[PDB]
Design a binder for this molecule. Structure first.
Ligand code: E50
Ligand code: ZN
Length: 258
């Protein structure tokens, strides 16, 4: 009886196995745009994905992860609110059963259809596994998805999903350029938080872009054709794999803009 996305194993149960679920810097949160503080000390975000080596795509039974070679100083996030350099290791999404829900962060209580998380670890801790044990170990660039026009740079991802339908399946996935997922503006909000999945470790600097990307109905419908269950197991569509907004507690959300 392990964690997932349902009534008896979903977010409201996670605290029993992972008591940090009720901690002081949990994610996601609602982003109140009027109260977020413009911080003129914040720097432009530096996203350098010119050398990203994608390797493989994995259905891990909660979502799908696009994986990158993180053994060289290839794809890096820096600047913004960050000190030092963070290396891209993977991305994944959270999405809904319906277009009106799916995001983890919300903006003045607005839910988006989905949310992309580009996960990076701080190079000063040597790898991802040591980084998650530190309060400044990870940086996640979050980008909202709305349903409208297709995202041409997303299509290569959508077209491989039929090959990873069920938990534990993987496929080779080389030469994918994550730059084709970045909205036009890098204006952002930032705050200290956590992983949104167990183990819920409080190691993340969140950087949430204000500008969503558009994806088509057809693209998100293909996300919704995944299963939570294993092969040869009864079908559980991979949908509503999002954690609701958590208490802000003693935190400030800062804005890079306006
Ligand atoms: C630490 C052991 C660990 C971390 N995550 C998972 S599943 C979700 C996932 O791969 C993941 C990994 C990192 C981050 Cl930062 C986030 S999220 N959703 O907070 O972006 C999700 N399983 C085990
Ligand atoms: Zn995530």
């Amino acid at each position: 009886h392990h964690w997932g996305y349902g009534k008896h194993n979903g977010p409201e149960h996670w605290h029993k196995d992972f008591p940090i679920a009720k901690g002081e810097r949990q994610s996601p949160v609602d982003i109140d745009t009027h109260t977020a503080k413009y911080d003129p000390s914040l720097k432009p975000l530096s996203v350098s994905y010119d050398q990203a080596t994608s390797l493989r795509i994995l259905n891990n039974g909660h979502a799908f992860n696009v994986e990158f070679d993180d053994s060289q100083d290839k794809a890096v996030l820096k600047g913004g609110p960050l000190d030092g350099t963070y290396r891209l290791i993977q991305f994944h999404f959270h999405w809904g059963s319906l277009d009106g829900q799916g995001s983890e962060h919300t903006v003045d209580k607005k839910k988006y259809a989905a949310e992309l998380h580009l996960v990076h670890w701080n190079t000063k801790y040597g790898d991802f596994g040591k980084a998650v044990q530190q309060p400044d170990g990870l940086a996640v660039l979050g980008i909202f998805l709305k349903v409208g026009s297709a995202k041409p740079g997303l299509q290569k991802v959508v077209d491989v999903l039929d090959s990873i339908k069920t938990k534990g399946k993987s496929a080779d996935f080389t030469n994918f350029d994550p730059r084709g997922l970045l909205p036009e503006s890098l204006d952002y909000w930032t705050y200290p938080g956590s992983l949104t999945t167990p183990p819920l470790l409080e190691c993340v600097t969140w950087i949430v872009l204000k500008e969503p990307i558009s994806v088509s109905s057809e693209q998100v419908l293909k996300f919704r054709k995944l299963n939570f269950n294993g092969e040869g197991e009864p079908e559980e569509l991979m949908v509503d794999n999002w954690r609701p907004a958590q208490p802000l507690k003693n935190r400030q959300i800062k804005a890079s803009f306006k």
